[PDB]
Amino acid sequence: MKYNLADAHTHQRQSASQQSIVSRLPQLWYEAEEGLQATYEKRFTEAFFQLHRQPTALVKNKTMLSYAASISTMVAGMFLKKERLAVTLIEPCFDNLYDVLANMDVPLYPIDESVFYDVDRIYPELERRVRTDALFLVDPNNPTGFSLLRHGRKGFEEVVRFCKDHDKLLLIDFCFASFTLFEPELARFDMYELLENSGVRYLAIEDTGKTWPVQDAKCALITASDDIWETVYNLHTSVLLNVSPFVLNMLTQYVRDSAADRLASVREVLTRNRECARKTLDGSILEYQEPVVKVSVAWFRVDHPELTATDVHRLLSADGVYVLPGRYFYWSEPSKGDAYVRMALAREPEMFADAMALTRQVLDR
Amino acid sequence: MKYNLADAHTHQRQSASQQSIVSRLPQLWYEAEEGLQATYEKRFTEAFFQLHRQPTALVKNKTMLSYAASISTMVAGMFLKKERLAVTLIEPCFDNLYDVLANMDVPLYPIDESVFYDVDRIYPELERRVRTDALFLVDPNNPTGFSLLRHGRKGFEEVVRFCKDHDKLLLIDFCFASFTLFEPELARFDMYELLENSGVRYLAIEDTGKTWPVQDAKCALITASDDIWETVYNLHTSVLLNVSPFVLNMLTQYVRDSAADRLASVREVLTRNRECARKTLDGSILEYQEPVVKVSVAWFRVDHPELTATDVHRLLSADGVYVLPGRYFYWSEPSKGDAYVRMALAREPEMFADAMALTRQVLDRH
Ligand SMILES: CC1=C(O)/C(=C\N=C(/CCCNC(=N)N)C(=O)O)C(COP(=O)(O)O)=CN1
Numbered sequence: 001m002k003y004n005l006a007d008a009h010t011h012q013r014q015s016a017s018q019q020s021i022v023s024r025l026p027q028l029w030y031e032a033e034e035g036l037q038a039t040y041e042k043r044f045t046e047a048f049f050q051l052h053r054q055p056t057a058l059v060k061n062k063t064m065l066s067y068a069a070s071i072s073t074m075v076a077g078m079f080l081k082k083e084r085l086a087v088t089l090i091e092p093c094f095d096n097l098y099d100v101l102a103n104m105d106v107p108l109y110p111i112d113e114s115v116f117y118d119v120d121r122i123y124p125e126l127e128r129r130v131r132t133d134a135l136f137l138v139d140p141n142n143p144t145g146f147s148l149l150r151h152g153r154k155g156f157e158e159v160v161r162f163c164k165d166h167d168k169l170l171l172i173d174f175c176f177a178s179f180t181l182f183e184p185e186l187a188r189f190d191m192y193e194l195l196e197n198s199g200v201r202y203l204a205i206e207d208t209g210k211t212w213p214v215q216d217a218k219c220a221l222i223t224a225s226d227d228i229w230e231t232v233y234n235l236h237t238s239v240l241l242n243v244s245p246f247v248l249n250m251l252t253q254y255v256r257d258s259a260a261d262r263l264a265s266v267r268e269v270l271t272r273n274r275e276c277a278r279k280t281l282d283g284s285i286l287e288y289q290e291p292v293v294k295v296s297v298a299w300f301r302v303d304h305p306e307l308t309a310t311d312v313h314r315l316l317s318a319d320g321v322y323v324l325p326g327r328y329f330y331w332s333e334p335s336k337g338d339a340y341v342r343m344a345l346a347r348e349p350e351m352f353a354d355a356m357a358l359t360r361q362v363l364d365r
Numbered sequence: 366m367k368y369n370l371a372d373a374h375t376h377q378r379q380s381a382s383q384q385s386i387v388s389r390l391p392q393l394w395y396e397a398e399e400g401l402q403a404t405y406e407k408r409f410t411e412a413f414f415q416l417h418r419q420p421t422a423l424v425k426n427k428t429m430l431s432y433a434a435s436i437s438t439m440v441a442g443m444f445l446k447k448e449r450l451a452v453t454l455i456e457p458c459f460d461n462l463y464d465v466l467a468n469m470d471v472p473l474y475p476i477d478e479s480v481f482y483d484v485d486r487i488y489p490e491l492e493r494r495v496r497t498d499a500l501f502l503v504d505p506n507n508p509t510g511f512s513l514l515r516h517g518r519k520g521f522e523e524v525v526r527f528c529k530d531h532d533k534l535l536l537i538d539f540c541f542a543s544f545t546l547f548e549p550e551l552a553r554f555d556m557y558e559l560l561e562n563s564g565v566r567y568l569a570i571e572d573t574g575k576t577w578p579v580q581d582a583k584c585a586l587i588t589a590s591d592d593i594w595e596t597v598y599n600l601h602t603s604v605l606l607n608v609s610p611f612v613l614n615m616l617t618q619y620v621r622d623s624a625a626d627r628l629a630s631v632r633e634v635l636t637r638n639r640e641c642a643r644k645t646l647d648g649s650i651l652e653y654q655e656p657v658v659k660v661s662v663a664w665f666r667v668d669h670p671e672l673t674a675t676d677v678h679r680l681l682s683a684d685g686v687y688v689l690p691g692r693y694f695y696w697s698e699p700s701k702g703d704a705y706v707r708m709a710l711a712r713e714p715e716m717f718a719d720a721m722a723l724t725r726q727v728l729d730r731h
């Protein structure tokens with residue numbers, strides 16, 4: 001038996017109310033056939049930004065939809081190349097973001113996540129360290145679950161202040177932002193109000209695929225500041241005319257379903273696995289790194305005098321447990337990741353607990 | 366009342382047997398959910414290349430799957446940019462191919478479709494006119510329905526001979542190739558056998574979204590020659606890890622359904638609309654251009670001393686009929702396209718017939 005705890009894609013099963021969505025897939029199909037594409041785009045975008053509490057995005061009504069967040073990222077990549085912009089990119093970060101931008105020949109330079117830990121040091125650290133015209137953040141971050149929302153509004157406000165002051169393009173990947181929702185202290189505020197009010201040049205990417213168990217039948221959203229909107233619109237329309245109205249109709253049901261249960265069916269699965277990993281590996285050579293935000297991945301430091309993350313990945317995979325070593329997140333210098341391991345949490349809790357038992361057995365040598 | 370005959374996306378409704386696929390979407394969901402991603406990739410790729418009769422592609426087993434043909438095209442674009450290659454691209458052709466490659470800063474130079482009309486002139490015409498390192502064809506072509514398959518095997522064989530002899534990367538978009546299938550004289554042969562045997566450097570793109578009424582819940586396929594396979598694999602993997610196994614499972618049922626009826630439910634709808642347009646517009650200012658292949662779009666020349674395609678589009682859209690001016694297909698020189706109009710055929714026949722009656726009414730006023 002193999003245990004894939006590697007990719008962060010959703011592989012948990014449907015909740016009871018989500019099984020009701022599955023049951024009406026035929027009607028969702030025939031509805032999308034009879035209705036207008038624009039209707040399903042509007043209903044999806046409205047449901048999404050109502051759940052995420054981003055009302056400014058619905059007033060501006062300039063958001064464009066694509067097959068996946070990486071496709072939105074490639075549209076951003078075309079804009080970066082057209083404007084001769086290099087990117088300072090968050091590190092650590094899931095390295096496919098580096099890979100796709102590097103494959104588009106965007107020059108890329110790291111900035112360590114620790115620059116954002118102290119709210120009163122964010123602005124001077126960016127002034128000293130950001131030497132490109134574009135800054136690309138992932139918030140909450142993958143793999144660490146870090147979020148500027150630890151600082152309330154002020155963390156994002158300081159980043160936006162820096163980028164506006166210095167005429168930088170601010171790109172933000174909000175794929176994990178659903179995991180802040182309904183949190184008493186961390187629930188995201190209206191980011192588009194801040195982005196619009198500041199006049200900063202920006203590209204904001206949102207996603208459905210990591211939140212819901214939709215088997216990667218998904219939709220991503222990109223929103224651009226008004227000054228670049230037309231250029232980005234034309235870039236986007238060269239990639240695709242439309243996302244499937246069937247998929248949009250289906251995703252709208254998942255979004256509405258999660259508004260009704262305040263994301264309980266998502267949060268409860270991740271919590272069960274996060275807590276199982278924490279308890280099972282407490283005191284082991286894999287040291288759990290508590291995240292700011294309860295995201296769908298768990299991050300561990302290797303605590304051993306000799307073994308590295310490469311060793312831990314090898315030993316676990318030999319027994320059928322597949323995790324990702326940190327080389328896949330320190331994209332500018334993979335050797336820096338040899339002290340870390342990431343595990344995916346969007347999984348069925350039974351398989352996950354069996355994987356945790358086997359993992360502890362292996363680590364106990 | 367609006368009649369969208371512009372984009373070529375499939376908007377016809379489901380056949381009786383396709384309705385049985387829609388009715389089983391819950392079952393197809395749970396299959397993919399409990400199953401392995403690689404299972405649904407393999408079963409889809411097998412069904413697809415069985416229907417298209419491309420057995421070599423299944424032996425090589427190196428084809429990669431993406432959300433849509435434009436995404437596969439952007440992977441090819443990343444390869445073209447990494448190698449710093451200029452492209453000679455077929456003209457006319459749907460200009461989104463030009464747009465996405467131009468937006469990736471790929472240099473693009475046109476070659477007219479007519480270089481392929483005479484099989485014994487293909488090679489010398491390419492030697493004169495292809496002065497870049499890459500050649501990008503669309504076969505069958507959009508909007509004209511032209512295909513090298515009018516020449517049997519020999520048209521493609523001459524193109525491949527040229528590209529091999531002169532060290533050209535050959536890119537081919539096969540998205541309209543389903544419309545050749547089961548044709549007595551035009552059915553595509555195994556293209557991958559020729560591409561592999563020749564040793565030519567190539568990128569080949571296949572599609573589902575224009576064939577079946579799957580509401581753009583679709584999948585495209587890209588296959589590279591062995592010498593560039595690893596590079597292209599790494600480029601492709603940076604774009605996506607996987608296509609939805611639910612979508613793959615669903616699409617596999619459409620492919621199998623059309624194997625069972627020899628694509629009749631697709632062909633008959635397109636033929637009904639093609640014939641309606643031909644009969645309705647016979648003798649009008651829109652001169653039907655008979656295609657080599659019965660593709661899902663119809664192409665017309667504007668036969669008038671003053672009126673352009675832009676004028677025709679304006680007049681028709683004022684009464685709610687939306688066609689495309691040919692400017693959107695002469696991407697190197699859009700004015701050339703003001704002599705042509707394209708109409709989408711993948712449409713419910715009753716809507717299409719009403720659109721045709723209104724179209725001739727509008728045209729009969731000028
Ligand atoms: C915060 C974030 C992610 O974590 C993420 C994806 N996570 C991944 C890649 C898996 C490998 N991806 C690949 N090979 N192309 C992960 O396991 O963390 C993406 C991209 O989303 P799409 O793949 O385009 O749907 C965007 N923002």
Ligand SMILES: CC1=C(O)/C(=C\N=C(/CCCNC(=N)N)C(=O)O)C(COP(=O)(O)O)=CN1
Pocket residue numbers: 237238239240241371372373374433434435436459461503507538540541574575
């Ligand atoms: C031969 C061919 C096509 O005709 C075609 C698409 N036809 C179109 C563009 C519609 C507009 N597309 C856009 N704005 N991106 C048409 O109406 O002919 C595509 C690309 O397919 P995807 O859109 O990625 O699914 C590839 N090969």
